[PDB]
């Protein structure tokens, strides 16, 4: 520790590398949820897609 810096408080003392959550499936999740909504809309036709 050296110089004038904010006191560090990184919470990286556990096995954090085993609990990293990536988001590479974020575009895929958007696709899957859109397909589910599209499928739901046809099931409940002519009921409004906005729900109750």
């Amino acid at each position: 520790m050296k110089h004038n810096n904010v006191i560090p408080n990184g919470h990286f003392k556990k096995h954090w590398q085993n609990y990293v959550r990536t988001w590479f499936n974020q575009p895929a999740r958007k696709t899957r949820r859109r397909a589910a909504r599209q499928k739901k809309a046809a099931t409940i036709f002519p009921r409004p897609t906005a729900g109750s």
């Binding site: 520790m1 050296k2 004038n4 006191i7 560090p8």
Partner: protein, 147 residues
């Protein structure tokens, strides 16, 4: 960007810029905030006065919504009125605009700065400082309280 990293400029210089005598060892002064009172004492006192110790009262389960109180100053009050409404204010001196700061996400009205000259305003707010009320009144306006 690897090609701009200075280690590349140090290729072929043995010590990689960390010296022959001192070297680059693992943790020659302890890890993190170690020794804050013993061998890093000067650093903490010089750059972080007040770091060690306890002050004030605890507050168990403190919820910040209870303390929500956004403030707006006198000098910024006129900027909330729409431009089209500003022209109306100068077109009829008999009436005055009603500025309800709560509709713009403000609770208390503070008194920094001055109001537009020769323009009375009726300010509607939850809270107001005494200077803010005085400046509003001396300009021909009035203060209304809400909740």
């Amino acid at each position: 960007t690897t090609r701009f990293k200075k280690n590349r400029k140090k290729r072929g210089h043995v010590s990689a810029g960390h010296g022959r005598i001192g070297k680059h060892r693992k943790h020659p002064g302890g890890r993190g905030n170690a020794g804050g009172m013993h061998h890093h004492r000067i650093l903490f006192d010089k750059y972080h006065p007040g770091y060690f110790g306890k002050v004030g009262m605890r507050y168990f389960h403190k919820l910040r919504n209870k303390f929500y109180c956004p403030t707006v100053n006198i000098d910024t009050l006129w900027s909330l009125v729409p431009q089209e409404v500003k022209d109306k204010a100068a077109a009829n001196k008999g009436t005055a605009p009603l500025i309800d700061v709560t509709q713009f996400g403000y609770f208390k009205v503070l008194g920094k700065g001055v109001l537009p000259t020769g323009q009375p305003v009726v300010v509607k707010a939850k809270l107001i400082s005494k200077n803010a009320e005085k400046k509003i009144k001396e300009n021909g306006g009035a203060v209304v309280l809400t909740a």
